[PDB]
Amino acid sequence: QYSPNTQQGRTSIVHLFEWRWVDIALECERYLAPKGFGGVQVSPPNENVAIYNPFRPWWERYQPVSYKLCTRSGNEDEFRNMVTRCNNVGVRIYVDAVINHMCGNAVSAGTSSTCGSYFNPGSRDFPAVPYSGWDFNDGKCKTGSGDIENYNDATQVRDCRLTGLLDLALEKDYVRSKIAEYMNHLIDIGVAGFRLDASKHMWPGDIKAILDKLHNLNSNWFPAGSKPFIYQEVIDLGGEPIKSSDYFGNGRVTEFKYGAKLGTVIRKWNGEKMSYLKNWGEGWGFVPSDRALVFVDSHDNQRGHGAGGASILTFWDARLYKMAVGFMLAHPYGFTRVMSSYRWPRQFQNGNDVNDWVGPPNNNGVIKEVTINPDTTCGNDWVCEHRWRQIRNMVIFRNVVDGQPFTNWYDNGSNQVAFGRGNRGFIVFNNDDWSFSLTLQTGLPAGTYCDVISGDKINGNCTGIKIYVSDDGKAHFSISNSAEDPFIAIHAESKL
Numbered sequence: 001q002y003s004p005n006t007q008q009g010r011t012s013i014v015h016l017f018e019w020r021w022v023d024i025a026l027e028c029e030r031y032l033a034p035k036g037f038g039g040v041q042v043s044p045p046n047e048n049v050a051i052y053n054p055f056r057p058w059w060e061r062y063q064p065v066s067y068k069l070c071t072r073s074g075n076e077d078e079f080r081n082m083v084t085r086c087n088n089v090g091v092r093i094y095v096d097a098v099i100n101h102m103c104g105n106a107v108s109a110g111t112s113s114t115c116g117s118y119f120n121p122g123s124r125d126f127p128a129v130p131y132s133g134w135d136f137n138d139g140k141c142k143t144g145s146g147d148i149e150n151y152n153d154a155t156q157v158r159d160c161r162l163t164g165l166l167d168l169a170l171e172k173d174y175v176r177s178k179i180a181e182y183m184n185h186l187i188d189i190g191v192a193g194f195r196l197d198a199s200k201h202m203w204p205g206d207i208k209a210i211l212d213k214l215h216n217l218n219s220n221w222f223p224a225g226s227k228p229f230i231y232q233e234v235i236d237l238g239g240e241p242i243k244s245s246d247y248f249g250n251g252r253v254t255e256f257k258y259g260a261k262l263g264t265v266i267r268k269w270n271g272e273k274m275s276y277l278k279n280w281g282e283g284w285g286f287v288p289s290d291r292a293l294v295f296v297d298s299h300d301n302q303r304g305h306g307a308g309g310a311s312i313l314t315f316w317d318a319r320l321y322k323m324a325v326g327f328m329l330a331h332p333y334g335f336t337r338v339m340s341s342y343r344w345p346r347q348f349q350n351g352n353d354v355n356d357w358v359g360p361p362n363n364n365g366v367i368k369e370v371t372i373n374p375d376t377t378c379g380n381d382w383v384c385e386h387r388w389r390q391i392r393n394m395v396i397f398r399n400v401v402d403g404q405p406f407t408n409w410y411d412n413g414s415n416q417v418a419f420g421r422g423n424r425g426f427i428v429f430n431n432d433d434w435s436f437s438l439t440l441q442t443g444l445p446a447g448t449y450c451d452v453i454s455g456d457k458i459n460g461n462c463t464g465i466k467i468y469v470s471d472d473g474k475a476h477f478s479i480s481n482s483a484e485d486p487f488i489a490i491h492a493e494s495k496l
């Protein structure tokens with residue numbers, strides 16, 4: 001459950017936040033497969049509540065009504081079709097599994113669901129699964145409100161409602177089975193793994209009990225004995241009775257401290273500087289590399305809804321973001337996930353963003369198709385960070401340097417550092433307020449390399465900066481603190 005199951009040479013997955021199945025299908029064929037991406041994180045494929053107040057918010061997808069594959073992203077056929085086409089081009093699908101709960105207890109009974117399934121939060125009735133009052137932790141929770149009131153009580157964090165969301169009784173075999181029934185349907189369809197939503201609110205043991213019920217991956221696409229990839233969403237910063245390590249026996253876990261610290265380092269908050277990244281990784285108190293799923297921002301914290309809050313870098317901070325994703329895709333620690341978002345009318349007031357609820361681009365609630373502009377960018381308000389030259393190229397950079405050790409580190413004691421990945425790649429960063437110009441040891445073979453940040457190698461020529469490596473591996477670099485992208489990256493496959 002620790003292995004991604006991506007095919008040889010692909011090292012990252014991209015979160016295509018709120019995309020339709022049909023658009024993801026096309027994206028696998030026309031860009032992801034050709035570009036060397038390993039897989040895609042899809043938004044919950046199961047029927048959810050249709051919330052109109054606010055109008056169709058993004059979080060309404062974390063409020064399940066049944067396990068029918070019917071949502072704003074498409075129906076069951078389109079979902080199947082998507083997994084098949086993507087798999088056929090070597091791009092895996094990972095489902096966002098919302099199994100800790102159903103919808104909010106305050107939600108009104110009726111058929112206001114993405115598939116028309118009837119549900120009644122009041123009476124605990126979800127006939128479409130089916131579930132009844134006997135399947136929730138109402139009687140198990142010991143708080144006066146029934147919700148989670150204190151996070152220093154590991155019991156209540158698991159047994160009570162997360163801000164009103166009906167908590168499933170995961171110790172019951174009936175519930176575990178309905179859930180495994182759901183997940184096995186997806187595995188047999190072809191999905192390669194799952195993102196376990198709100199895993200902090202589930203008992204490690206209950207999760208393990210559900211995993212034991214899961215099938216091996218579809219043998220038409222995966223070698224016999226392949227276990228699904230499991231990554232547990234667990235927000236664990238400092239001091240909390242619950243540790244992300246309690247979940248190692250089930251699979252990987254989201255390391256939220258990663259993006260948080262990278263954000264404060266790159267923003268240079270409270271005196272932090274890049275030279276401190278020398279021992280980036282476990283040395284910084286992060287989980288072991290083989291259990292970590294890393295990222296700079298997520299659909300949650302990019303809009304102040306998760307961990308990290310303000311330090312987190314997003315597409316809104318374009319310049320520092322590219323540099324952050326660059327360092328991430330270049331560093332060996334963890335398995336990397338790339339964010340791909342959409343624009344929303346950010347409206348700050350007294351510090352908070354009153355539009356952090358805004359759902360994906362749409363027309364009367366109908367999500368907009370992703371349009372591809374002539375320069376490869378996206379229209380209809382989709383940001384498509386994965387299509388940005390600097391990002392897409394670092395994705396490939398990771399593939400090329402895969403397996404290569406961390407070496408030839410350089411830092412000026414401030415904010416300009418550089419390091420290499422064996423003899424397959426090298427990257428340099430200038431985050432100081434003054435130009436950088438020096439000769440570093442790259443441990444790379446002599447030759448002429450195309451800088452993949454400022455450009456692309458295109459048949460015998462570089463469309464951007466060019467670096468020259470001497471016989472002793474040395475090479476000169478020069479980056480103005482005023483450059484569009486203050487960092488340079490070259491690799492074995494960008495050599496002329």
Ligand SMILES: C[C@H]1O[C@H](O[C@H]2[C@H](O)[C@@H](O)[C@@H](O)O[C@@H]2CO)[C@H](O)[C@@H](O)[C@@H]1N[C@H]1C=C(CO)[C@@H](O[C@H]2O[C@H](CO)[C@@H](O[C@H]3O[C@H](CO)[C@@H](O)[C@H](O)[C@H]3O)[C@H](O)[C@H]2O)[C@H](O)[C@H]1O
Nearest residue numbers: 059060062063104163164165197198199200235300305306
């Ligand atoms: C939200 C976060 O809380 C903890 O995270 C805590 C953490 O444990 C604690 O230690 C400290 O660091 O603060 C964190 C922030 O709450 C968990 O540990 C972590 O797993 C969880 N995040 C996952 C699960 C949910 C829940 O359904 C999703 O939420 C998402 O869906 C929810 C359900 O529609 C949304 O609530 C929404 O619906 C509720 C229904 O009763 C409303 O009461 C609420 O006001 C409304 O915002 C939420 O705003 C959104 O972010 C989210 O996309 C997904 O990533």
Ligand SMILES: *[C@@H]1O[C@H](CO)[C@@H](O)[C@H](O)[C@H]1NC(C)=O
Nearest residue numbers: 457458459460461462463496
């Ligand atoms: C590289 O570009 C130059 C023109 O800038 C051209 O003369 C040369 O032949 C090109 N090399 C290749 C291999 O296309």
Ligand SMILES: [Ca+2]
Nearest residue numbers: 158167201202
């Ligand atoms: Ca729970």
